[PDB]
Amino acid sequence: LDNQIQEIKESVELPLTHPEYYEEMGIKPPKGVILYGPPGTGKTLLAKAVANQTSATFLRVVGSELIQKYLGDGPKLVRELFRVAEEHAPSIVFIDEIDAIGGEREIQRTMLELLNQLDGFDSRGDVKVIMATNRIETLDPALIRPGRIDRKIEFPLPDEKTKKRIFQIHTSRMTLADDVTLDDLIMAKDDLSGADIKAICTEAGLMALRERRMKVTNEDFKKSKENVLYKK
Amino acid sequence: DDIYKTHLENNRFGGSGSQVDSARMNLASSFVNGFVNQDKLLTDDGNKWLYKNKDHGMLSAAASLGMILLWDVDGGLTQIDKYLYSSEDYIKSGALLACGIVNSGVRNECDPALALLSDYVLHNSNTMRLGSIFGLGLAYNREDVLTLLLPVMGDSKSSMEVAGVTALACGMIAVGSCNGDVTSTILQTIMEKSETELKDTYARWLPLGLGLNHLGKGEAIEAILAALEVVSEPFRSFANTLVDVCAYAGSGNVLKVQQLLHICSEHFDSKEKEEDKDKKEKKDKDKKEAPADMGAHQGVAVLGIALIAMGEEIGAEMALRTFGHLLRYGEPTLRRAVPLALALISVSHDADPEVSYNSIFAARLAAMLRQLAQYHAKKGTLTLCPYHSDRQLMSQVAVAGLLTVLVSFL
Amino acid sequence: PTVTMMQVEEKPDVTYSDVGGCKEQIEKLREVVETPLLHPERFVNLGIEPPKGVLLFGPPGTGKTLCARAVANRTDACFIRVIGSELVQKYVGEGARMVRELFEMARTKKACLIFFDEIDAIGGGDNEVQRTMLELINQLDGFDPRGNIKVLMATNRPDTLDPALMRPGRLDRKIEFSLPDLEGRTHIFKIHARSMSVERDIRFELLARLCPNSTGAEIRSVCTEAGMFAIRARRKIATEKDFLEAVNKVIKSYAKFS
Numbered sequence: 001l002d003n004q005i006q007e008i009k010e011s012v013e014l015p016l017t018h019p020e021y022y023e024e025m026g027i028k029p030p031k032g033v034i035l036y037g038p039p040g041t042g043k044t045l046l047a048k049a050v051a052n053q054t055s056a057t058f059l060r061v062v063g064s065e066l067i068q069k070y071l072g073d074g075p076k077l078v079r080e081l082f083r084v085a086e087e088h089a090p091s092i093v094f095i096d097e098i099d100a101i102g103g104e105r106e107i108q109r110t111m112l113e114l115l116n117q118l119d120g121f122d123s124r125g126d127v128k129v130i131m132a133t134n135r136i137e138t139l140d141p142a143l144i145r146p147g148r149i150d151r152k153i154e155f156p157l158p159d160e161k162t163k164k165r166i167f168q169i170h171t172s173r174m175t176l177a178d179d180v181t182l183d184d185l186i187m188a189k190d191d192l193s194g195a196d197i198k199a200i201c202t203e204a205g206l207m208a209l210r211e212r213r214m215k216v217t218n219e220d221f222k223k224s225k226e227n228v229l230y231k232k
Numbered sequence: 233d234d235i236y237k238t239h240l241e242n243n244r245f246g247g248s249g250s251q252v253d254s255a256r257m258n259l260a261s262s263f264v265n266g267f268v269n270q271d272k273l274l275t276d277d278g279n280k281w282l283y284k285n286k287d288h289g290m291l292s293a294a295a296s297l298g299m300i301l302l303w304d305v306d307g308g309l310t311q312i313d314k315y316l317y318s319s320e321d322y323i324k325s326g327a328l329l330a331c332g333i334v335n336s337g338v339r340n341e342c343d344p345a346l347a348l349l350s351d352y353v354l355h356n357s358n359t360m361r362l363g364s365i366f367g368l369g370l371a372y373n374r375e376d377v378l379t380l381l382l383p384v385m386g387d388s389k390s391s392m393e394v395a396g397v398t399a400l401a402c403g404m405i406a407v408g409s410c411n412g413d414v415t416s417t418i419l420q421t422i423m424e425k426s427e428t429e430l431k432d433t434y435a436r437w438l439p440l441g442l443g444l445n446h447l448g449k450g451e452a453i454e455a456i457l458a459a460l461e462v463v464s465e466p467f468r469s470f471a472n473t474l475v476d477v478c479a480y481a482g483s484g485n486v487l488k489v490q491q492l493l494h495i496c497s498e499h500f501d502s503k504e505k506e507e508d509k510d511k512k513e514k515k516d517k518d519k520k521e522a523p524a525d526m527g528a529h530q531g532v533a534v535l536g537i538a539l540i541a542m543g544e545e546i547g548a549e550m551a552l553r554t555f556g557h558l559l560r561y562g563e564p565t566l567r568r569a570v571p572l573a574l575a576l577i578s579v580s581h582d583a584d585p586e587v588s589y590n591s592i593f594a595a596r597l598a599a600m601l602r603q604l605a606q607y608h609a610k611k612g613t614l615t616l617c618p619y620h621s622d623r624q625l626m627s628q629v630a631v632a633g634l635l636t637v638l639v640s641f642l
Numbered sequence: 643p644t645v646t647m648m649q650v651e652e653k654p655d656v657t658y659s660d661v662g663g664c665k666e667q668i669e670k671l672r673e674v675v676e677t678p679l680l681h682p683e684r685f686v687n688l689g690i691e692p693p694k695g696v697l698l699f700g701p702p703g704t705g706k707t708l709c710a711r712a713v714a715n716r717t718d719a720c721f722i723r724v725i726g727s728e729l730v731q732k733y734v735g736e737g738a739r740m741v742r743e744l745f746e747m748a749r750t751k752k753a754c755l756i757f758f759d760e761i762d763a764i765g766g767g768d769n770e771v772q773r774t775m776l777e778l779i780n781q782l783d784g785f786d787p788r789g790n791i792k793v794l795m796a797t798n799r800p801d802t803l804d805p806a807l808m809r810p811g812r813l814d815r816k817i818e819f820s821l822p823d824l825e826g827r828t829h830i831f832k833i834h835a836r837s838m839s840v841e842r843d844i845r846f847e848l849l850a851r852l853c854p855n856s857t858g859a860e861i862r863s864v865c866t867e868a869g870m871f872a873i874r875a876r877r878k879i880a881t882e883k884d885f886l887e888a889v890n891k892v893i894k895s896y897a898k899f900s
Contacts, residue, residue, distance in 0.1 A: 003874075006876070007873070007874055010873060010876065011873065016580065021878050025838060025839060026836050027838060027869065087584065087585075087588060088584075089580060089581075089584070090581075105732075116648065120653075121648070121653075122652075122653075123653075124653070151870065151873075
């Protein structure tokens with residue numbers, strides 16, 4: 001995913017960073033990109049959202065829970081996002097785990113309000129909005145043609161290779177034994193996303209916490225596998 | 233190298249020089265001319281621009297050519313020579329002011345201004361004393377300029393800026409002295425200060441130069457000497473608290489910080505302004521404790537005191553976060569006071585709060601000060617004096633003739 | 643409501659010479675947007691019922707670019723572009739007050755010009771649409787708002803029967819898409835030379851002759867894969883030898899099935 005991360009890096013890191021080939025070029029795509037992946041779970045999407053945290057302002061709003069937890073006030077918080085995104089623009093607007101549509105007719109008018117209001121109706125574009133969701137087919141087609149004009153990226157299905165690589169990244173911070181092999185894991189699993197391997201990591205470190213040990217023998221790795229293997 | 237390595241466009245001369253009108257934003261266009269900088273188109277933009285201007289605006293615009301020519305010593309004489317000894321008093325007095333602004337080591341412009349000086353009532357050479365005593369103070373323990381200043385303070389003109397640029401000029405001559413001095417210069421201006429109890433602005437800008445002569449101390453007992461011989465009813469208590477401000481430039485002396493907390497609640501609402509305004513001078517290095525609850529107060533100026541306490545620092549997100557609340561105010565002196573530090577603290581984020589001010593208003597002071605802030609955007613005493621003298625902007629436009637000649641701007 | 647202050651369109655956009663190659667048709671649609679704007683009394687004194695505007699239909703191609711051109715050629719006060727998706731909505735009854743309040747804004751804005759986009763969404767059960775199109779034509783044929791300012795329909799299908807039989811009375815100057823010849827694309831090239839770093843070694847006549855049947859949509863996709871594959875190749879300058887595969891790919895791989 002090196003090209004997939006350097007294309008979002010070069011895509012959204014062109015404004016306000018390395019500006020000698022952005023404002024002199026006369027392009028200015030002030031719309032950001034749209035992220036989605038079959039694994040989802042915000043692991044790769046947060047590993048790509050963290051690639052922009054180096055020199056920028058980060059703003060993470062996960063899901064529409066803060067909207068659907070009270071009376072239907074509506075797009076007023078989105079207008080607040082337009083006044084804070086207008087009076088203060090370094091911040092890339094990063095929205096992860098978009099499960100608003102999944103009332104519904106008010107999500108269509110705050111979707112038309114963020115679509116219409118996001119284009120920069122009063123200025124020459126003002127804020128980059130990177131969107132991240134789990135499924136791209138459930139979203140209404142109103143955000144596609146008017147909103148997305150620059151680029152949207154798709155995540156391929158590895159089946160084996162980035163299951164091994166995602167295992168390597170999930171187990172990079174953790175400690176894996178020598179006898180813990182990878183072929184039986186990437187092979188024994190059948191269409192399991194990053195959340196399930198994050199769950200077997202969760203039973204690895206959590207079941208290691210059950211015995212208050214930092215090391216996980218193979219026998220304790222299958223006995224630890226039984227924890228979420230029974231819980232899931 | 234500035235003309236070589238930098239390339240500024242013309243749409244700010246034309247645009248920023250196009251939103252000016254009503255003879256006050258025209259003064260903001262003298263601010264455009266003097267504090268715009270490569271390109272010098274607005275400098276040579278035809279004529280009659282100074283003829284439409286006012287009198288103190290003729291001082292500010294005559295000094296604007298002094299601000300555009302901080303270089304080209306040989307060109308300064310052949311550019312200001314047209315405005316020298318002209319028909320209009322403010323053209324020649326602001327022209328000598330320009331001669332004092334353009335350089336600080338020429339010292340050959342003195343004689344034509346110094347010879348004319350004596351007026352003894354009102355005459356032009358007292359305004360040439362404004363621009364030439366102030367501009368020579370910018371050019372400068374001399375022992376001929378103060379002997380020439382003896383009939384200056386002895387004259388005692390009704391114009392405030394006479395003693396203004398006298399005290400400030402001799403103070404800039406005296407800043408950095410060896411543990412200060414209590415000599416007959418500032419003793420003489422203390423006795424002649426208390427001589428006439430009129431126009432308390434004298435009692436405001438004379439302690440400016442007093443405390444400037446107090447600067448440079450390491451162990452001076454001048455706070456106790458002034459505690460003896462400058463203490464009176466509240467017409468010299470501002471001088472006492474000014475010597476208290478300038479005598480405590482800053483060290484580890486938290487006893488004066490709890491003294492600051494105790495005397496902060498004084499009924500007099502000016503020693504609060506300057507004595508509480510000393511915070512940006514005292515703790516200027518350990519700026520992590522400088523954010524305080526001064527904005528949460530409910531007095532008359534305290535929010536202005538913290539607003540000045542921002543200053544011209546690099547201005548991290550917390551400072552602009554304080555400018556979020558300080559930016560929105562209803563009084564014209566605080567809404568007028570916010571763009572100064574708002575644009576000094578930031579020298580795609582500069583012009584956005586300016587458009588926020590356009591959303592605030594759309595008076596004249598706020599518009600002139602917000603364009604003046606556009607031009608602002610685009611322990612050295614030389615950067616500490618000009619604004620501590622500028623803390624008295626809430627007056628007539630005559631002071632705004634001395635507002636344009638601040639040397640703190642690099 | 644929000645459609646009042648939102649409807650007013652500012653921030654001008656794509657200009658004149660982006661026309662997709664029309665030399666005479668750009669006059670046939672220019673002499674009604676630019677010529678009447680220079681003086682009202684001129685076409686009023688030109689006789690009887692001066693022409694309102696023109697009619698655009700057929701294949702989309704370079705659509706929405708000539709309307710942006712009309713917004714660009716506005717000399718004094720940035721104009722507007724009514725969209726079709728606002729008339730046909732849920733809770734009927736607001737489209738009538740909508741079209742009457744925007745025509746009222748046309749009365750308030752000293753003979754403002756109005757453009758109608760996507761007429762097929764309100765053209766052609768459909769009684770709630772018959773309110774918007776029969777009341778719409780009832781307000782166009784009406785002399786209340788104005789009868790000289792502007793008519794311009796930009797859509798994909800001319801299959802709207804009722805507007806086709808009500809249009810010959812008031813609407814006039816219908817034109818086709820007028821696909822360009824070989825020499826027409828180099829104008830769109832010369833104006834889009836602001837695109838992502840067209841090098842001076844790139845010849846616009848070579849790029850024009852290397853793509854037949856390449857109307858404004860297909861060369862707009864030439865620019866889309868040009869700047870897109872310019873960003874994706876980690877390059878900063880564009881060279882005809884670097885993206886000619888994207889040119890003949892975007893015209894041939896997309897001209898096989900279509």
